[PDB]
Every structure is written in C-alpha cells, then in structure tokens.
Amino acid sequence: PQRPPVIWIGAQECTGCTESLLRATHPTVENLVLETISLEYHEVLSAAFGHQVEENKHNALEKYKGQYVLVVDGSIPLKDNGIYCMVAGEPIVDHIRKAAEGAAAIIAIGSCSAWGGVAAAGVNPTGAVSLQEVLPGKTVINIPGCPPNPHNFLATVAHIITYGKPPKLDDKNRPTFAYGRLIHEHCERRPHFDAGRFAKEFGDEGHREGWCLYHLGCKGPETYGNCSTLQFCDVGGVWPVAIGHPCYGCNEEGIGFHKGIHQLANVE
Amino acid sequence: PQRPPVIWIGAQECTGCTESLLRATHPTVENLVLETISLEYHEVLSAAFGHQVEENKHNALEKYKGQYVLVVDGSIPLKDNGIYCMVAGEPIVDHIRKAAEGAAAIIAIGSCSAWGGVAAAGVNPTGAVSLQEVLPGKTVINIPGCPPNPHNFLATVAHIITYGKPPKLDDKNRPTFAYGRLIHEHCERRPHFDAGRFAKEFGDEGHREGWCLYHLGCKGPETYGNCSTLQFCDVGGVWPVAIGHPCYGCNEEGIGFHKGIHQLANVE
Amino acid sequence: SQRITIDPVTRIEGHLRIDCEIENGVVSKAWASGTMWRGMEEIVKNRDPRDAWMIVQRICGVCTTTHALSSVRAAESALNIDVPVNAQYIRNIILAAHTTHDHIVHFYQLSALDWVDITSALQADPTKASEMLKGVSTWHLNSPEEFTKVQNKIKDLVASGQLGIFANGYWGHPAMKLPPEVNLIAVAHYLQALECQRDANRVVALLGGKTPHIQNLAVGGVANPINLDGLGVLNLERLMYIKSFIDKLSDFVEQVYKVDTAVIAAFYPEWLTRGKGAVNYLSVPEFPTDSKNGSFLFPGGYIENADLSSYRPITSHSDEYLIKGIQESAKHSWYKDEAPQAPWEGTTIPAYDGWSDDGKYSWVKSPTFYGKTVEVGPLANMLVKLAAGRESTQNKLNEIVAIYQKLTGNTLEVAQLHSTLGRIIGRTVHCCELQDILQNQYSALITNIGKGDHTTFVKPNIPATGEFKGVGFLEAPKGMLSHWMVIKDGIISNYQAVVPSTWNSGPRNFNDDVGPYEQSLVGTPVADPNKPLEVVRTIHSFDPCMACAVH
Amino acid sequence: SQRITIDPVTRIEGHLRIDCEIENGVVSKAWASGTMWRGMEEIVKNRDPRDAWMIVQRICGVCTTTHALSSVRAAESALNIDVPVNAQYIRNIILAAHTTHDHIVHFYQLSALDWVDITSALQADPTKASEMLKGVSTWHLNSPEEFTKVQNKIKDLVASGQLGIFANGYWGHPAMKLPPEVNLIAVAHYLQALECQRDANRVVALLGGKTPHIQNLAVGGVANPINLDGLGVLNLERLMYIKSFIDKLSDFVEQVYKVDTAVIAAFYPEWLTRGKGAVNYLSVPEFPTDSKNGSFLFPGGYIENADLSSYRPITSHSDEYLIKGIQESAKHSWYKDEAPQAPWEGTTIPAYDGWSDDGKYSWVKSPTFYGKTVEVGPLANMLVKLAAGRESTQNKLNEIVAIYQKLTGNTLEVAQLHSTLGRIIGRTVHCCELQDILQNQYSALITNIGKGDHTTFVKPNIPATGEFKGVGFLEAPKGMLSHWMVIKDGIISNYQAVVPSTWNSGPRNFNDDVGPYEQSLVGTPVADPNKPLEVVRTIHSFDPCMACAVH
Ligand code: SF4
Ligand code: SF4
Ligand code: SF4
Ligand code: SF4
Ligand code: FCO
Ligand code: FCO
Ligand code: F3S
Ligand code: F3S
Ligand SMILES: [Cl-]
Ligand SMILES: [Mg+2]
Ligand SMILES: [Mg+2]
Ligand code: NI
Ligand code: NI
C-alpha cells in the first residue's frame, strides 16, 4: 500500500527538530519512515547526496504534486537576497517557495520556522523570518517549541492522514491538543504558586521540596504548550519545571530568546 | 555476591500489591529477584509448594535472622481467633508474628496492611486490622495505595539496602518521597479548581477539556500520595485524574472505601 | 491408603489447600479448600450502586479489571442502562489487554515450573537448543547467544547459593520429561514473557488510569474524555500511544507462547488423558460492540455431557435460561444457609467449624447450573467456540495441532482436549484470538470517533423507592463471572459474586457431587507422595484464584 | 580532468558544499564550504552572562548539551566559580549519555549507507549471515529469524515502489565491497541502533528535563534539586530510573557497534591508507570530578607532526599554553576582518561576496593552534589517550584490532589510524569507554549523596564594572569545543564559539594552508565523478556539523 509523501526542508535549522523524531515512540522514527509516511526528501537520513538527492526532490515534487506534506525547520533568512542559506547554489527561500506550490499541507516544525525563534532574536543578523511570512497565501500549521515534543508534530500528521484534515488550530494556527492552554493553567506546581511557596535559588529548601519556580523566572504564565501534561521522552515526569528549572518560554514569540531566564513573567 | 533477603507473606490480600511489581521498570521484577534481593519466600512465584515451601521459610527465618525484610500485603483478621486466614493449618497472624521476630525491617505494602483497607471497611466481617496493629512493639513502614506505585515500595527497599536505614517517614510511618504531600497540593488541575472550571459529569464539555474533577468527588484534597507526579506505569501522563476519573482516596484511611466516589472532599 | 495435604499451593492467586487420598500411588479422592475469606459481598452492601465497582474490583488484583467491569454491568442491568458504544470499545480493549497479560503470566510465571527443570537447563548445549527451533518458530530471540546469556544467569544464581523462590523445587522428579535444551529454551521464554506482559499492561494503564485496579469506569460508561483536539484528555496522540503497545504483543504470543504450548503437549502426551474435571461447560459471549450491550465478538454457550453437536448458544447477557439456572450451595462450605440459592436471594453467613472430610471444609461455595457441576474457563470457552463453528478458533487450534503433529507424528482429537493439557491449550488459543480483538476494537474506536461520536457516558438515575435486580456477566481469564446486585430504596440490599474459580474450586455440593478440581484429581499418578508435583500440575491447569473463588 | 560539486552533502548536520578537482581519476584539490550562517555570537551579545547558555545551546541540536555546558563553563571561568561536585557528576552523566547517542547515530544512520548496499541485502541468505557472526559477537539479536524479518522489511519497502530516503543511492557502485550477507547484517544493526540511542537519550532526559536541548544547567551548577526524601525532585526513585537506562546501553555498544567497526575495516582495508587530514591533533581533558573544575576522567593534549612520544599533556581547562595558541582567520571566509584573531578579541562581521576558488568560499572560519592546522575529534582524542598511555584506551583499541586480525590475518599499527577508518575507530573506542564513565559517575553521585552532600548550585555574583574574560572547554562528540565570553559592565561584550567542525571543516587559512576536510580528500580515487561516493566516505568520517562549524 502507498504511504503519504513528505518533503522536509531545513533552512536556518540546528537539526534539533529532526532529532526530536529520534526520541519519539508512537511512532518511532523507523516506523514513521517504513510504515506511516514516505519520507521523499530529508537531507539528514538520505542515502543520495548532491545531484542525486536534488533529482529525488524534483521527481517527488512532480510525482506527488497536490499530495505531499511540506515540513520546514529553521528560520528563512531574507537579508541580502537570501544568501545566508544556500543549497545547490540557490537561496533556501526559493527551494521552500517552489516546494510550497504543490503541497497538500505545510507544517512549520519548531519555534524558528513557526515565528523566527532564536535565529531571529536580538539584532537578527540575517533577517530571519517565519515560514508563514515567506508563504503569505498559504495556511501554515505552526508546531512551536525548541524543539517541540515530536508527537505534537506526529499526531498532527496522523490527523491529516487518518481523518483527511488538520487538527483544530488556534488563532496562531497551532494545534489545540498541544498548544490550547497556558502551561501555568495546567501546572502541577500551581498549588505552591497559590500558597506563596516559591523556590528562591536552585538548591534552596523550597526548590528541594518541588515548590513553584515563578520567582526563578518561570514563563509558564505566558507560554502556551503541553509541557506539563504530555511532557517529554515518554518516561514519565520529565519536563523542565519537574526537573527543577523554570520554563524559558521557548514555545512563545516574545518570551523565549527575548526575556532573561530570571526575568519574571506577567501573570493573567 | 550475597543479595539482601526478603520474606513476603500475604494475609487477606487480593495479590494486586504483588502484581504491582510486574509493572515495575526500575527494577523490573526479573531484575529485582535475580540482582537486587534474594526473595526467600513468595507464594505467588515459588517453585516449591506445601511442605517444601514451608521448609524454605523456616530455613530462611533461621539463616537470615536479624537480616531479612519482612513484607506483608493484605489485612490480618483477628475475629474468631484468626481462622479467616489459615495457611498450613495455622492463623496467618501467627506466621506473621513469628516472621516479625527476626526481621531487620518490616513493610506493610498497600492500604490493606497499612491501615486495614477495603477488607476492614463497612461492617468489617473478619475483624481485619493493619500490620502495625498486630505488631505493637515494631516500627512498620507503611506504603499505602491500592496498590501503590511499585517504586514507592522498591525505592524504600533500595534506601534500606544502599544507605543502611529506611527513608525519612511521616507521622504515619509513610516514606516522605512518596506520601509527603496532598495530591491536591501538587495537582496539574489546580489552576482549573482555582478558576471554578469543573467537570460536572463524565463526557461533558469541561471534562473533555481536562478541567478539575473536584465536583465529581475527587479526594485529592484529603489524600497524601505521589499519584500526580510519579503517576503510574512509567509511560507518562497516567494517573486516575489524568485519565478523567476523580481520586477515590485509596491511599488514605477514612477516605478510600468509606466515602462514595461522588461524595465531596473537605478542602484544607 | 495414604492421606496427603498440599498447603499452601503456590504459583496461584491466594490461599488454597488440596488434600488427597492416595491408593497404590494413584489419587482416589481429593478435597479443595479456600482457606481465606474477607466478606467482600457484605462490605459492598448498603452503599450507592455507583460505588460498588471500586470496592469489588478488590476481590482480586491478578484478575484486576474483571470485577470492576462485571459490577458496572450488574448496576447497568438493574437500572436498564445501554452503554455508549465508545465506552464498550474502551472496556473491551482493557479486558483483552488485561487477559493477554494474565494468560502469559499464568503459562510462564505460575505453570512452567511444574513442567520445566531449571537444574537440567544447566546441562543444555545452547547451540543445540537453538537448532531444535529451526522451522518450528520465527521468533527473533531464540539464538544460541540469547540462550547462553540465560544459562549464565541461572549459573550465577546457583553459584550464589541463594536460590530463593527457585529453592527446593522438583528438580530431577521422575515426572520431569523435558531434555536439558528444552528446559533452557523455557527459562529464556519465561524471562521474555515478562517483557510482553509489561507491554500488555501499558495498554491497560493508558485507558484505565493505572493497573493494577483500573479507575476509568462508571455505571453508565467510562470516565475517559474523548476529544481528538483536547489537551490533557483522550486525544489522537494518546490513542497512537495505546496502539504502539497493542502492536508489540502479537509476535511473542504467536511465535513463543503458542509454540511452547504445542511443545509441552508433545513432551507430555499422557497429560491429554487425565485431569478431566467435568462433562458440562459454560461460557458467556464477550466484547459487546453495539449500542445495546450486545453484538459480541466472542460467542458463549452451554455444553452438556461433552456433546458439542447439541450445545445451547448464549448470545445475550440478559438470557433468562442462563440467569435462572445458576445457584450456589454451602452444604460443604463454611456458611450457615446450605440449600442451593439463586444469587439475587443469596446469603453469605459465616459458619466456620474447622475441617471435616464429610462436612464443611472450604470458604468456596458450590455453584451448579440447573443442578449440575460445570467447568468454566478457557477449556469451556474454546469448546463452546468449536461447537459454534467459529473458524478463527478452529484455525488457531489447528496451528497448535500442526506443531504437535510435526514433533510427534500424531494429531489431537477434541476428546483429548477434556484434560489438563486441553485446558492449557484453550488458554493459549484464547490469548492468540485476543490479539485480533485488540486490533478490531482499536480500529472500531478510531472509526467511530471519526464519525463525530465522542460520547462515553450516560448519567444514571436511581429510583429512591422500589426493589430491582441486575446481573453483569463477563468472560474473565478464568471463565464466566457474574455479579448480582439487588437495589432497594436506592442502596445495595444484596450483592453476590459467582466467580469462575468458585465454579471450578468449589467443594462437594448439596447433592455431594464433586466439583472440577476435586474430580480432575481422581486417577492422578503420584510417584512421590512427599512431593506430589502431578497433583499441582492438574490444579494449576485451572489457573486457581482463591481471592476470586471466596471473596 | 574535471571540477565536481557535492551540494548538498547529506547524512551530516546542516549545510555543506564540497568541490573537488579530479585529475587522472583521483581528487587533486578540494574546497569545503559551510553555506548557512545565523550569527549566534551576535544574537547572544549584550545579554546577562547567566542567560547565554539557553541561547547558544541552539547552535546545534545534534550535539545538543555541548554548547550549553561549554557556555556555563565559560561564564564560570570569567567569574572564577568552582562548580559543586554533584553538579559535575550530573553534567558528566548528561555529556556521556548524549555522546553515546551521538556516536551510535553517526555510525549507523549517517555513515553506514556509504559502505552498505541495501539492494545487495535482498540477495543475502539469512542463515549464512548469522553463521558468519559465530564466535565474532555474543549479541543476542543476530539470529537468522531476526535477519529474515529485516530482509522482509526491505523487500516490502522495495515492493511498494516508494524508496523515499533510500532512493537513488549508490547501489552496485564498484567501491561497495560487502557481501550480501554483511549488507543484511548492517541493516539489522542500523534498526537495532535506533533502540539503543533512544535509551541513551532517556538518561539525558531524566537529568536534563528533556532532549533535545537540556534545561537543567546554570552558571554556578545545575537546577536538579537533590533530595532522596523529596516528592517531585531528584530522589532515589528517579536515580534508580536513570540507572535502569544506563544499564541498557553496554551490550549494543560492545557486541554490535564495536564489532561492526572492526568488520568495516576488515572489508575496506584500503581506507586505512587514505583520508589523513592533518599531522597535528588537539583534545581537552573531560569529565571533571573534583570541587575545583578538574581531576578529569579522560586526558587531553596536543600532538605535533604525529609524534605521540613527544606530545604535550593538557590536564587543566585553565592551561595558558592551550588558551594562548588558539586563533581564527577569515581570509577565505565570508567575514570582513581577515588577520588571525584570538577569540576574546574575535569579530564576526559578515562580508558575503559569492564563491571564489582563490578568495572567500565559506561561512566557516579557519582556526589554528600557534599558526598550525589541527584535526580535532575522536581520532585526536584516541591518539592523545594512546600518547598518555591510558590502559583503558589501549585495551579497547586492541579488542577492535583482535577482531580485525581474526577476520583478515593482518594487524593494525598506529600509522594506519591516521586515516578515514582510523577516525571511525577512534569514535567507536570513545563510545565504548563512555559506558564506564556513566557507571563511574552514577556511582560517584550515589556515594556523595550518601555522605550528606545535596549541594548542586552556588549563586553567582557579577560585578557591575570591570572587564572579565572566561573560556569554557569541552571535549564534544566531534572534538574540542571552546566558548569565549568577555563580560564588561555586567553584560556580554564579546562572545566567540570555536567549534570542533570549525577546526576540521574550515577553509584555507591566512597562510592558504589547507584544513583537515580539504587535506583528507587529496588522493581520493573517484571511480565515477558523477557519483563521488569515495569523497563522501572520507568527509562523513569527520562527522560534519555545519550548524556547529558556522553558528
Ligand atoms: S526550533 Fe529550536 S530545535 Fe528546532 S531548528 Fe530552531 S533552534 Fe533548533
Ligand atoms: S509559575 Fe511555572 S512552576 Fe509556578 S505554577 Fe506557574 S507554570 Fe508552574
Ligand atoms: S492494598 Fe489493594 S491491591 Fe493491595 S492487597 Fe489490599 S485490596 Fe489488594
Ligand atoms: S480536586 Fe482533584 S482534580 Fe481538582 S485540583 Fe484537586 S486533586 Fe486536582
Ligand atoms: N479471571 C479471573 Fe478471577 C477468578 N477466578 C475472576 O472473575
Ligand atoms: N560535537 C559537536 Fe558540535 C560540532 N562540530 C560541537 O561542539
Ligand atoms: S522552555 Fe519550552 S519546552 Fe516547554 S517548559 Fe517552557 S515551553
Ligand atoms: S484513588 Fe489511589 S491511586 Fe492515587 S489517585 Fe487517588 S490515591
Ligand atoms: Cl538527599
Ligand atoms: Mg459469592
Ligand atoms: Mg565562532
Ligand atoms: Ni482472580
Ligand atoms: Ni553539532
């Protein structure tokens, strides 16, 4: 039986969004590529290189026109006519716009493609922008996080495959099952917040009792995500706050990579 | 190398406390019995039966006098001179008191042995009591729940083996790492409680958004445990409230098996 | 005549005593005795019908889920509630996954050490052991290297001098027939079984909220909130996770457990000719798939005097013929009221007077069906499916027979299934067929949610006056389970559980007729009356659960 | 003679272009080019020193953890902070487990398809494949049954006509030398590697809070709260869980990865005589175990002109000889300031002008050590350990050489390690030695907590005036990493990362001297200039990371 085709293009990526797949369990990356999808282009795992892999991509864009899911990680740099990311001698923005023309669905995996992320922060040396900014006529599904839990992506793809449409999205085109709620509106340390039980420094008596990390700079009050519920790596109990460190807001534009670790969040 | 010896006696048990071990991952039950301990007596797994297994117990009680951990699951029935649980023609209370004489440490695994549990509820047909009630001169470590997460037990044993003493206990002799905090004082649905966002019936709109289960009878406010943090089965995200059902208070004397599922908890 | 006692019987659930009279090395008469009682029927009385399932689930933690599911079905029966089909799919996945764990653990952790000699495994050649399985199994963990690693674990345990639960076992007993190589294969499979059953319980956990003792039921359906787009509820990500564990079970079940079952039969063929417990068999249909508590994936029925051609099908949990036939006696049990009682009129009044060969000698009641003794459990279940002409069951049995025939050159006739090994075979066939139940019901759930049905629960109303009666049937891992609830003025006025090990383990009945355990032991050869391994082999084939039998 | 471009190079991290002049069927001259830049050094400028690590960790997600740990060490260096020993144990476990994942994925997911022909695996006899490993490995998953299941997955993928990322590969190329059976073994091990690396990352996750991109560090120590008796923090239960994953890594590493490394050398011995990148090698000591950022479990040093006997040991991350030697040039890079720069005085001013063979052709800077080109990474690391006389390293290399000896009748001399295969061997030896690091540091942590030390963090102070310079060294999976922080008036006034792939991938330097990638390719035979598999074989041996090289 034929598997739904996927084209994955990395722009100004660190590869952490691909690496998230190697932690996934449902499906595992081996089951993803052998059973769930046909990964038609992915430069991290491709046997073919250079001329051969660019042939593969051109053939796949033609063969699967109107059928493939396009996935992009990393920001897209517009400064100086796109030369801050060049693949096969051409600006990655041009590779992305060409692949976008025939896509059935387009996913920005990670904060960099979803809203510019760390690559667009500070002075933004390369004029990095989001995938939605380079594809104004297209509905881009945003799966933010640095990187997201890989199942935020895989269950989005599965919804498209199994039920024939995207999952329900919020007003930033983020799937509601993963991004529908503030972390602070579903955080197991909320009782400590409510009682004024706060860690003041790592290793202090409150910190060693699992108290709230608000006064260490926790951005849960201003970050949408599922980090406190789905958490990470499917082992149970693993997310930054449960390990002892505040949320940094890496999901959320204007929070992660903008605010200091210890800068206090606004509470709604 | 010699492994620390364990004697496990079941009284009025349902075997769920032994079965908890078959879900454990750190250690798995195979690693527990081959690497961590020497399980000298356990009727569920023993190759020997009848006279041979009673010989094994007598031999182990002599050889390991002052060295073994005694574990009991189930309540101990005192009514009618002990006849509601007879093994090899003798009341189980007599087997337990004999094994208790030479124990290095004594553990009541589960609500039944910790405080009488379901077997002591209602009219208490058999005059079921706790392990501490039958061993007045002994410090019994209580690991309640019906059954507890098996690691509440295994990490207690590991602390005894590795550091040579029990873990820190509360005033009910429960290990603080597992029972030191109310579930409601570390529950990820506390934000919903705080906002008055309550499920009113299973399958209603609030229930289908993961809202607080207080008005379904959640006993989190009156139950000490680690169900919201350690959770169950090491798969991530698995405890009663996360699945959509209120805490019943199964850890806690006078809550579980006394209060109705839908009866409201007192909030501190 | 010599009298022996086996007390405790180990590698079961709970507290069992077996007594045997032995004449010239052959068991002539036996007694089964449940030696622990809690009074769980009395504990649950006088409560809200909605609360019963959380309390009576604690009848047993080996067959966790089963009493919870029977209890909600009993309340739903009393109240005339039709359970939402999504709640049925979820209940069915939990019961099927739980039963997979239960059967695997029974065959390996509880039963294998009756048949397997671990000291003999130390003399095995791991390469020869692996070569024996070529063309017999496609399992990926039968290499000489796997078997050498397992052999070394046994060597290291023996070398420690701390054998613990492997100590004073029946090593070198004359009834131990496996060659060294097959003993070593069995120990390797014993350890691999622990990984498979752990995956089965991960399925149960993700729908139940934990296991043991699930926490997702209700009178009226389930507590799982279906919302594919919802954070913190049963969404597509959680369903994909459940599916990832369902997918991990089949290979062990088909390539190890099914094969080992055929091989044990091949080495112990005399055990096809003993351990017959009854001539009548009962099973209830299971895994309802419609909106009205019916359309079962597995059929049920009643077989009388071993005649499959004249069996009576049971297609409904409301079958009046099934309901009206069931009674229990305490003539030879430690309860006061001895005449056979229909469970809606049942009492459980303790009357302990100690052991008497001819009087009362057990906490287990004596169930009958229209006055007959009946065996329940996987043998009953398999024979009813064969009587129904279920092709899936005939085909799976034929796969075990084909392996047996390859090893022995002999076939297996249905007459040879009325036996200790037939009982073990029916269990294995059940475990194998349950993997298709899990695939089917996962697919059904995904499909139904896709049609826009997210319903899971129908809130009950309980009239505050009137008296009304309900019964919840379930085909549990050990056989037909029924919970019987009477509601009067809004609270439970009577509660009676009739549990599969009650049918099988119960003592002599109101007519002094012998129950399955006691009947099965007549004729058992006992080489060494100090070490009656042959008795425990037959008793373990019934998968005794005494917390279940007695409650 | 002709000019080829390989763009993109796949099965690496990030964006790499390789150009080669080919004369008489042999590479005569090569260019390495990093084709993507972010300006991560500029992004982190003017921030609080304490915030840098969360930003600069995003230099790379393949070598996640490494930039986070180098960044906190750089701030700790500037501020003169001594890290609590518990924080060192935790940092060390994370780096060792991460590196285990990183090397396994490199050998299998990134490199194997240079050496392995998956089409040829379809012609394999699974039984013959298994027989080849008898007495070569004790791995428990080399059965014919495992290999048949893997062969069938390949068959099914080919049958679908959707080869996806396996499409248009170098199947039947003349430089593909493995027999069908060995191709099939490699694919089976490729799939098994994915399970092992997943377990390595579960160790990372339980201390880091997630992976990729850990979140448990701080300038001053770690955010893990140690309390054996604490609910919701790093207690004995959580530590036991960590240990359960540490214990799962060794068997795959020792019985599959280590063996496969020896076997690839046995089939491709010509690749021991090509791909030499440099004559100078640098590594830093790693895994500090004292209270003052020293007492490293692994040694470091500098080798000049391949002379192990006269190498210079590096025992401290504060070694002024190491610090003062390091400079970077942008003469042939797309930056404005071209003269060699010490990183505390470094600039990163973009000056893109397009590709020129003799001008600027890369976003990678050109690092030197006292004016010389240096190779870093596992080959450097292994050669320094052999120069130090480290018995653990000698012994592990000897185990790979013994497998090679058994298969070929030939031995391996140190001279043969200056090669494409030597690089791969150093990586494998590193992965094997890291499993003892994990056991050692887990044990050290348990022992130290037991002495009553729960300290994990010392809160820093940052003077609001003054200028302070710090450098954080780390032996990353790809080699020596350094982050260089200047603090002025309390904020980061300069930040420069010198990354291992910068050393190896950097273009021609201020003196037009050739870096390791470009040097290693001279002399490479290229059978088919349209399909330059031989070039990609040597380039993959360095484990390129271009997000790292360029940042
Ligand atoms: S979102 Fe984060 S992990 Fe993904 S490419 Fe960007 S920096 Fe890397
Ligand atoms: S501030 Fe952070 S740790 Fe505290 S309750 Fe909110 S999200 Fe949780
Ligand atoms: S505590 Fe619960 S699970 Fe354990 S023996 Fe008692 S009823 Fe069973
Ligand atoms: S009542 Fe229950 S669900 Fe609600 S916040 Fe408290 S413990 Fe959580
Ligand atoms: N299966 C099971 Fe338990 C018994 N007997 C029940 O019901
Ligand atoms: N390892 C790694 Fe990444 C590179 N090059 C860093 O540091
Ligand atoms: S930093 Fe990111 S991973 Fe979650 S906890 Fe905060 S959104
Ligand atoms: S019912 Fe028990 S298992 Fe935990 S969630 Fe409540 S204490
Ligand atoms: Cl501590
Ligand atoms: Mg009953
Ligand atoms: Mg730099
Ligand atoms: Ni049971
Ligand atoms: Ni990197």
From Swiss-Prot, chains A, B:
It is an enzyme of class 1 (oxidoreductase). This is Hydrogenase-2 small chain. [4Fe-4S] cluster 1 binds at residues 14, 17, 112, 146. The keyword Disulfide bond does not apply. It is found in: Cell membrane; Periplasm. This is one of three E.coli hydrogenases synthesized in response to different physiological conditions. HYD2 is involved in hydrogen uptake. [4Fe-4S] cluster 2 binds at residues 184, 187, 212, 218. It comes from Escherichia coli (strain K12). Binds 2 [4Fe-4S] clusters. Binds 1 [3Fe-4S] cluster. The chain holds residues 46 to 313 of 372 of the full protein. Its main location: membrane. GO terms for cellular component: [Ni-Fe] hydrogenase complex; ferredoxin hydrogenase complex; membrane; periplasmic space; plasma membrane. [3Fe-4S] cluster binds at residues 227, 247, 250.
